[PDB]
Amino acid sequence: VETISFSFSEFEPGNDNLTLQGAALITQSGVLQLTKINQNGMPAWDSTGRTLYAKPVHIWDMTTGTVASFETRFSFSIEQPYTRPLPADGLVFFMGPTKSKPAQGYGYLGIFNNSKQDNSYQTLGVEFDTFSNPWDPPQVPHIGIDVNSIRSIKTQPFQLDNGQVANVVIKYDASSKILHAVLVYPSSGAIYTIAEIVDVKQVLPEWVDVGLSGATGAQRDAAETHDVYSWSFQASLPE
Template identity: 40%
Template structure:
């Protein structure tokens, strides 16, 4: 898959995935499909459901957490999530076939307001998902720290090392737990734009991601996950962030395309 050909210039790589998304969107033959492309949003017709402290900014960007300066030495937890308002057909219970999908989003994390904590996550969860109890700060708004029953798959951008984390800031693939099954180093630069491309290839049951930094460097991560064994046949997708110290998390763009019948044939040829 193209994610491992990291010698591609950033612009070419992102353009390649954009072409793939267009091809997928124009070749959807099944009614069990979803596609969207969010750039600048308005409250009138955003197609996004907001939870917690998440909101649309006047600029049309999505703010996942509150970013107002806190008084010196005083910190407050803030957590917010933005979810696609439409459900995603993930697999067909009659045929056992799973969908493949491509999603991309870009974000900026600004850490100028205080010490760096917590992070951001793209997640897939059962329909009707809400912010769990006991899920602020290190649990990123997706995990209830008081129970072992958490059902989701996610790609996290973790800024703070907790007792269960590897050394340093990292990107991790999470399955029903905030303890990542696989990680790579996260090279955070405060205020810079990070682009993320995620592909799930159903035939190989592989979730792959490319993280493209503003300086052109690229990190990759992948994990074999049979989503049929983890998630129900219909899901919601979203972005969530949590912090204790006031760094801001803004989403600048987000696109997604999925098809239960035809996506895989295109994704596998990238």
Template identity: 40%
Template sequence: MSVVSMIFIFFLFLLNNVNSLSIKFRRFHPQLDGISFQGDAYSSNGVLQLTKNQLDAPIGGSVGRASYDEAVHFWDAKTGEVTDFITEFSFVVKALNNSSLFGDGFSFFFAPIDSKIPKNSSGGFLGLFSPEYAFEPSKNEIVAVEFDTYSNAWDPIFPHIGVNLNSIRSLGYVQLESDFKKGSVGHALISYNSDSKFFTVSVTYDNIPNFTSEISYIIDLRKFLPEWVRIGFSGATESLSFEFSTFQPNSNSIIFQGDAFTSNGVLQLTKNQLDSPIDHSVGRASYKERIHLWSSKTGKLADFTTKFSFTVKSVNSSVLLGDGFAFFIAPFESYIPHNSTGGLLGLFSPETALDISKNNIVAVEFDTYSNAWDPVLPHVGVDVNSINSIGYVEVAARHINKGFTAKASISYYSTIKLLEVLVTVPDQKPPYSVTYKLAYVIDLRFLPEWVRIGFSGATGQLVETNNISSWSFRSSL
């Protein structure tokens, strides 16, 4: 979770306009005239705070805007003349509690003068777009430069500076320098030349001399914005997030069942000792807190994304593996069923594994052995109340039996009820990685309002080791 602060200077020039305008703020005081606040934004200690910034209170799901309180004449409807402008500001993005997980970022925006924070626009929507219309340019009227600190499903895979035109998906972007995570002071300059229609963003940092991040994009801003606009900043954080870059034996954030344990900084889901039998092993590792999946009061479902890296390894150089592991969502009181080793993956009992009326679980399985109910090849599958996957993608054997570390991303988009799975594995051939994709439309409200999330793994007569080396999770509720 991060807090976004705008500090030091906000400096705006508008040139070649009927009414030229110059604005300058060196510090931001609580009673300062000229700034309008929405949501959680406020001023403190001479800076603008766009989101909540209190260590003794929840700061998740925070969203705020701070904007100039007068309309800015951006272009002339009579003459078609568009203003040139330049704006400069300094900023700090800072994590709380020394967390390495940031989210979500802030933006400088141009919007209609009556623009307000959309509903449910926290997290990756940055207080700019509603989830319903975030990807529909025809439904929006906003231009923004985003400083995005977390990679959502629609984002590049790295923190970035992006130019957004009526959509949360950036049309152009450049990587955000990693030193921003250290609370470095950044200095942004955004300019527009109406003749060339060049929209340019450049960012420098105090602690990185002779370094500039820059992006340029050709835009006719008259096509996207009204004659009179509001200018300002918008920022947001996500409601729930956690991240484990490593797993410590004494961590109290993970609940273990069965044979699961931690060793050498990773989660081991099944037995992993060459000097003792490791067949017919089963284990679970789950987050200790319950997760709010949907609201019984409003019916609103959470949007969520979980990412993890994992390794499946054979034992004694065997080419035969068994049986796999899964990421699961289940009732909070869920435990490992009896006799659920092997192909049941610690998720289902043999008696009810194929009876959807007797189960209450959703899982994404990474299945390395073909049982009677499985496809003929190893696969990634979506399981809904049954061990029989309702959707799957087959995986080449060479991608799972070599002990490679793979990366998985599982996202749920509540507005379209879409569960999306992406799995990227190294490959020995160019481009040296392969991504498997799987999507399934499902309304998750058949699950309890509050759920447990975690991993489950099992071996049968065939064995393997299933290790999770990192894990992050973010949700909008």
């Protein structure tokens, strides 16, 4: 069995186990700020930042046809300081081709280049979308399961607890092909759940990079924070 796992209770600056891209940075306080925060403490618009684990993950093997089961957990907080314009754009946990660089920002969340369903993306993602684009359901924020497109195959609205820490659990059972995600706000006790069938063999390459990506809006002050406090991951390829 081929296993891989990591667990960051907090982030330490200078760590070489994480690849920071775009605006992403680790603070001295141990927080991973996916998108830029200005000198005045306000989140900057037109910002995109990602963080990829430094080792690729063996998700499936073409030879034996076996696929890995995996689980990831992370805590984040989003703060929306302005009433107008509408805050944007959100953050997303994703898996895709190795050696990737950030894509388009804004509503594409740093992982897509357009709104088409393209098999060449080879990307699986679980988004926490805060801005309603024309390809989105009208309710925001919402959790969404993205398969080769920013147009989710399944969506679940949730109420943002402004600036409060949200705990997320995403689990994939290779046997049943079910991807199930849970979001809990300890502050209010709110629990949201979403699940959908996804056969990763039809989506992802055998080896993938796992990461988190965040983006702020295309217009002035259409922004919010995308802070991550911890992140753990584990995958097992039956072999």
